[PDB]
Design an enzyme around this catalytic site. Structure first.
Site, PDB file in Angstrom:
ATOM      1  N   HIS A 106      11.890 -11.114  40.015  1.00  0.00           N
ATOM      2  CA  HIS A 106      12.472 -10.647  41.272  1.00  0.00           C
ATOM      3  C   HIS A 106      12.344  -9.137  41.397  1.00  0.00           C
ATOM      4  O   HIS A 106      12.444  -8.419  40.403  1.00  0.00           O
ATOM      5  CB  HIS A 106      13.957 -11.000  41.365  1.00  0.00           C
ATOM      6  CG  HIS A 106      14.247 -12.461  41.264  1.00  0.00           C
ATOM      7  ND1 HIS A 106      13.853 -13.368  42.225  1.00  0.00           N
ATOM      8  CD2 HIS A 106      14.918 -13.174  40.328  1.00  0.00           C
ATOM      9  CE1 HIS A 106      14.254 -14.576  41.878  1.00  0.00           C
ATOM     10  NE2 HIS A 106      14.902 -14.488  40.730  1.00  0.00           N
ATOM     11  N   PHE A 107      12.135  -8.663  42.624  1.00  0.00           N
ATOM     12  CA  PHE A 107      12.190  -7.231  42.924  1.00  0.00           C
ATOM     13  C   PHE A 107      13.574  -6.887  43.453  1.00  0.00           C
ATOM     14  O   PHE A 107      13.933  -7.267  44.569  1.00  0.00           O
ATOM     15  CB  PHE A 107      11.136  -6.847  43.965  1.00  0.00           C
ATOM     16  CG  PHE A 107      10.915  -5.366  44.084  1.00  0.00           C
ATOM     17  CD1 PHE A 107      11.711  -4.593  44.915  1.00  0.00           C
ATOM     18  CD2 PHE A 107       9.909  -4.744  43.361  1.00  0.00           C
ATOM     19  CE1 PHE A 107      11.508  -3.229  45.023  1.00  0.00           C
ATOM     20  CE2 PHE A 107       9.699  -3.381  43.465  1.00  0.00           C
ATOM     21  CZ  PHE A 107      10.503  -2.623  44.299  1.00  0.00           C
ATOM     22  N   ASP A 108      14.354  -6.165  42.657  1.00  0.00           N
ATOM     23  CA  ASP A 108      15.748  -5.916  43.017  1.00  0.00           C
ATOM     24  C   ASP A 108      15.892  -4.743  43.977  1.00  0.00           C
ATOM     25  O   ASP A 108      16.605  -4.827  44.982  1.00  0.00           O
ATOM     26  CB  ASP A 108      16.596  -5.680  41.767  1.00  0.00           C
ATOM     27  CG  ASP A 108      18.064  -5.959  42.001  1.00  0.00           C
ATOM     28  OD1 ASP A 108      18.412  -7.131  42.261  1.00  0.00           O
ATOM     29  OD2 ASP A 108      18.866  -5.007  41.933  1.00  0.00           O
ATOM     30  N   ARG A 165       2.586 -12.464  43.773  1.00  0.00           N
ATOM     31  CA  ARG A 165       2.110 -12.689  45.134  1.00  0.00           C
ATOM     32  C   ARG A 165       2.900 -11.855  46.136  1.00  0.00           C
ATOM     33  O   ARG A 165       2.335 -11.280  47.066  1.00  0.00           O
ATOM     34  CB  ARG A 165       2.177 -14.172  45.512  1.00  0.00           C
ATOM     35  CG  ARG A 165       1.820 -14.440  46.964  1.00  0.00           C
ATOM     36  CD  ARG A 165       1.770 -15.928  47.288  1.00  0.00           C
ATOM     37  NE  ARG A 165       3.032 -16.608  47.013  1.00  0.00           N
ATOM     38  CZ  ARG A 165       4.068 -16.639  47.847  1.00  0.00           C
ATOM     39  NH1 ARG A 165       4.007 -16.014  49.014  1.00  0.00           N
ATOM     40  NH2 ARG A 165       5.171 -17.289  47.507  1.00  0.00           N
ATOM     41  N   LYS A 173       9.541 -12.427  56.928  1.00  0.00           N
ATOM     42  CA  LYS A 173      10.373 -11.845  55.886  1.00  0.00           C
ATOM     43  C   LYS A 173      10.683 -10.415  56.317  1.00  0.00           C
ATOM     44  O   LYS A 173       9.770  -9.611  56.505  1.00  0.00           O
ATOM     45  CB  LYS A 173       9.671 -11.859  54.525  1.00  0.00           C
ATOM     46  CG  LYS A 173      10.605 -11.521  53.371  1.00  0.00           C
ATOM     47  CD  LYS A 173       9.888 -11.461  52.031  1.00  0.00           C
ATOM     48  CE  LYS A 173      10.866 -11.100  50.916  1.00  0.00           C
ATOM     49  NZ  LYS A 173      10.197 -10.915  49.601  1.00  0.00           N
ATOM     50  N   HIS A 182       4.921  -9.118  45.412  1.00  0.00           N
ATOM     51  CA  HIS A 182       5.246  -7.732  45.072  1.00  0.00           C
ATOM     52  C   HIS A 182       4.168  -6.910  44.358  1.00  0.00           C
ATOM     53  O   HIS A 182       4.350  -5.716  44.138  1.00  0.00           O
ATOM     54  CB  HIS A 182       6.568  -7.685  44.300  1.00  0.00           C
ATOM     55  CG  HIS A 182       7.732  -8.185  45.095  1.00  0.00           C
ATOM     56  ND1 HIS A 182       8.413  -9.340  44.777  1.00  0.00           N
ATOM     57  CD2 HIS A 182       8.314  -7.700  46.216  1.00  0.00           C
ATOM     58  CE1 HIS A 182       9.376  -9.537  45.660  1.00  0.00           C
ATOM     59  NE2 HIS A 182       9.335  -8.557  46.546  1.00  0.00           N
TER      60      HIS A 182
END
Length: 252
Positions: free
Chosen positions: A247-249, A138, A169, A140
């Site tokens: 997670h998007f690092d 949702r 955000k 990324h």
């Protein structure tokens, strides 16, 4: 020879009205859309959104179809819909329907290239606990497009993906590649995450991504973003079985 995509548009798209106006909306629409030609179709739903917004659902929350197939998708946002239910006194050819306006999440089945809606599966009300994997998609994933088409991309996507609900955000990246391509990253170059954990992976290939960053004058609930399109390697944190991104690092 109507295409499945065209059939869906005829039966389920009303991109000309924001909502049902009359209690006779269904009476007129079922007829005009040929849903009463050879019989009174008992139940039908029309969606009052742009074809773009509805097609976009095909790249949103993947859910199991009622028939057991896996190509169904639930919209992140509630949409304006009209349910049409045949009355008890209805009798062909003078088919009669109860018109019912609502705003719910829709679930559609998708097929083809382009990947578009071909069936309307259900509507849903919706708390709702999200899996970490579903949240990553949702926040990324944007497989609906190959890149940002305009400078307003982030303004719209940050909103539509609910990343501005309670606050803006500040920074967020969307990836324009297949889910399979992104999921494959969890089996590529293992690297340390920003937090020092070692369940991160850098994509071997560069990918089409859009960087969204809040502007300096952006103030909730008026979230404004600068849109930057780029081709970079992504770094994601992966977890669970199936081993998928959660997670998007970073991008590099």
């Amino acid at each position: 020879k109507e295409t499945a995509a065209a059939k869906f548009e005829r039966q389920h798209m009303d991109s000309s009205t924001s909502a049902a106006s009359s209690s006779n909306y269904c009476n007129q629409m079922m007829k005009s859309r040929n849903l009463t030609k050879d019989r009174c179709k008992p139940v039908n739903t029309f969606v009052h959104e742009s074809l773009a917004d509805v097609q976009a659902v095909c790249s949103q929350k993947n859910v199991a179809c009622k028939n057991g197939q896996t190509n169904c998708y639930q919209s992140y946002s509630t949409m304006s819909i009209t349910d049409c239910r045949e009355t008890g006194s209805s009798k062909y050819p003078n088919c009669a329907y109860k018109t019912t306006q609502a705003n719910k999440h829709i679930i559609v089945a998708c097929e083809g290239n382009p990947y578009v809606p071909v069936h309307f599966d259900a509507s849903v009300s919706g708390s709702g606990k999200e899996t970490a994997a579903a949240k990553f998609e949702r926040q990324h994933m944007d497989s609906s497009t190959s890149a940002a088409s305009s400078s307003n991309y982030c303004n719209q996507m940050m909103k539509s993906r609910n990343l501005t609900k309670d606050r803006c955000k500040p920074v967020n990246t969307f990836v324009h590649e297949s889910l399979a391509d992104v999921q494959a990253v969890c089996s590529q170059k293992n690297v340390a995450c920003k937090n020092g954990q070692t369940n991160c992976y850098q994509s071997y290939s560069t990918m089409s991504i859009t960087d969204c960053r809040e502007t300096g004058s952006s103030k909730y609930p008026n979230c404004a973003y600068k849109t930057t399109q780029a081709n970079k390697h992504i770094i994601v944190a992966c977890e669970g079985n199936p081993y998928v991104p959660v997670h998007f690092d970073a991008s590099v």
